[PDB]
Amino acid sequence: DRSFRWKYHQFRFLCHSNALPSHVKISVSRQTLFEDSFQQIMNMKPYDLRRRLYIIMRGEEGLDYGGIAREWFFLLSHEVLNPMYCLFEYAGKNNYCLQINPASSINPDHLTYFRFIGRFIAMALYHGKFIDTGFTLPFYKRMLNKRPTLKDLESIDPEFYNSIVWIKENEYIMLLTDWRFTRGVEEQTKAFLDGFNEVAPLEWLRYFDEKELELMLCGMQEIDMSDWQKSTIYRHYTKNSKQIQWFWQVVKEMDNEKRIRLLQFVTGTCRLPVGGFAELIGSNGPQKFCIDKVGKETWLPRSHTCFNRLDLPPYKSYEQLREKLLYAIEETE
């Protein structure tokens, strides 16, 4: 229940208490980056990856190894997304909802590559480096031994979610829910978790929730309040409605961390799209941040991350809306 700041410091300090001296060299070329990094890292002992990193980009004069490290992490974290490797894929249009490719077994040695990716992510977390791989929140759930829920089903598979939501309301459901997330990607996921656990114990993530973990891996960015409010559309509501005015009031009241938490709550990620909120992506294509008048005032506001939509009840007071919004943002998904 402690703040994200506290968990961050505790995790970093925990990493530092288990720090090893000396260093390790990783020699790669920026056009054989994937295979070279793979070979280098997988030919090393896991704990040795806790030593200070010196990425050797063959043919470059730079001596700022921190920047070289960061650039390497970014480049590789993007390189693992190459559809030629059949390691990852997307469940929706416009690179929406990254997931492990069930057909990854088309390459017989794929599990070693997933273990390598685990090691890699573990290295990024250990050395305080950021990645832009774009793992979804349920993925992080799996990393935190949290089971994916029905809401998550709405996040990654809206039609499946609608079907199930109908079946119900007019045990099976639970098996279906688990199956949608775990189908064809069992061994790959376990290999990833093992590779991660080789370098940095999963146990060290025990205090984080999924959004906080995503924040740990992606890094914090300041949110343009202006760009956000400009790209916001409304249903039934107008920008002059009481609830909307109060809403933006609350958002401006928020610090950056809280705004990020809101962004994660409504969109499903802390990452901003290229070109600002105007280029916001949901399932079924481009979809800007929307606010809808849905739900009773006795209910919390709720989100549809597939549509980047915020169901906001017509609360009769600013304080009520503020309370419910903060609570829903911090305690519900």
Element containing residue 292 per DSSP (H, E):
strand 290-292
Is residue 99 included in any domain, yes or no? Answer: yes
> d(Cα 163, Cα 306) in Å, to the nearest integer?
15
Question: Structure tokens of 214?
Answer: 């995503």
Phi first, then psi, for residue 303 (nearest 5°) are -120, 155
Contacts of 1 (CB under 8 A, 6+ apart): none
Is residue 173 included in any domain, yes or no? Answer: no
Domain end, chosen from 220, 247, 271, is at 220
Is residue 205 included in any domain, yes or no? Answer: yes
Q: Is 149 left (phi over 0), alpha (psi -120 to 50) or beta?
A: beta
Q: Which of 333, 283, 327, 16 is nearest to 144 (CA)?
A: 333
Asked if 195 and 74 sit in the same domain, the reply is yes
Phi first, then psi, for residue 50 (nearest 5°) are -85, -15
Asked if 207 and 290 sit in the same domain, the reply is no
3-class DSSP assignment, residue 16: helix
Q: Are strands 302-304 and 309-311 parallel, antiparallel or unpaired?
A: antiparallel
Burial class for 251, CB neighbours closer than 10 Å (0-12, 13-18, 19+): middle
Domain end, chosen from 163, 196, 220, is at 220
- CATH code, domain with 295: 3.30.2410.10
Find out whether 90 and 99 touch, Cβ atoms under 8 Å. yes
Is residue 160 included in any domain, yes or no? Answer: no
Asked if 139 and 276 sit in the same domain, the reply is no
Asked if 6 and 60 sit in the same domain, the reply is yes
Asked if 205 and 69 sit in the same domain, the reply is yes
Q: Is 41 left (phi over 0), alpha (psi -120 to 50) or beta?
A: alpha
> d(Cα 148, Cα 128) in Å, to the nearest integer?
27
> d(Cα 272, Cα 263) in Å, to the nearest integer?
9
Element containing residue 303 per DSSP (H, E):
strand 302-304
Is residue 174 included in any domain, yes or no? Answer: no
Residues in the chain: 333
3-class DSSP assignment, residue 154: helix
Annotated catalytic, 270? no
Asked if 198 and 316 sit in the same domain, the reply is no
Burial class for 74, CB neighbours closer than 10 Å (0-12, 13-18, 19+): middle
Q: What is the DSSP string of 254-286?
A: S-HHHHHHHHHHHHS-SPPPTTSGGG-EETTEE
Experimental method: X-ray
Question: Structure tokens of 44?
Answer: 């090393």
> d(Cα 48, Cα 34) in Å, to the nearest integer?
20
CA 128, 207, 210, 270 dihedral sign is negative
3-class DSSP assignment, residue 25: strand
Our count of domains for the chain comes to: 2
Asked if 191 and 213 sit in the same domain, the reply is yes
3-class DSSP assignment, residue 210: helix
Asked if 74 and 214 sit in the same domain, the reply is yes
Asked if 205 and 326 sit in the same domain, the reply is no
Is residue 155 included in any domain, yes or no? Answer: no
Which position has the token pair 């200070």? Answer: 52
Is residue 165 included in any domain, yes or no? Answer: no
Q: What is the DSSP string of 50-114?
A: GSEEEEEETT-----HHHHHHHHHHHHHHHTT-TTTTSEEEEETTTEEEEE-GGGGGSTTHHHHH
- CATH code, domain with 108: 3.90.1750.10
Contacts of 330 (CB under 8 A, 6+ apart): 261
Q: Is 317 left (phi over 0), alpha (psi -120 to 50) or beta?
A: beta
Q: What is the dihedral of CA 324, 262, 123, 145, to 10 degrees?
A: 40
Q: Which of 161, 136, 151 is nearest to 311 (CA)?
A: 151
Amino acid letter at 101?
A: N
Q: Give me the domain span that covers residue 125.
A: 1-145+185-220
Domain end, chosen from 177, 199, 220, is at 220
Helix axes 33-42, 110-126, angle to 10 degrees: 80
Amino acid letter at 171?
A: E
Among 97, 270, 290, 306, the active-site one is 306
Phi first, then psi, for residue 76 (nearest 5°) are -70, -45
Contacts of 252 (CB under 8 A, 6+ apart): 225
Asked if 210 and 282 sit in the same domain, the reply is no
Phi first, then psi, for residue 281 (nearest 5°) are -115, 130
> d(Cα 298, Cα 288) in Å, to the nearest integer?
27
- In Å, the largest CA–CA distance within the chain is 67
Q: Is 86 left (phi over 0), alpha (psi -120 to 50) or beta?
A: left
Find out whether 46 and 119 touch, Cβ atoms under 8 Å. yes
Asked if 140 and 260 sit in the same domain, the reply is no
Find out whether 83 and 90 touch, Cβ atoms under 8 Å. no
Is residue 7 included in any domain, yes or no? Answer: yes
Contacts of 163 (CB under 8 A, 6+ apart): none
Asked if 29 and 12 sit in the same domain, the reply is yes
Q: Which of 256, 132, 253, 116 is nearest to 195 (CA)?
A: 116
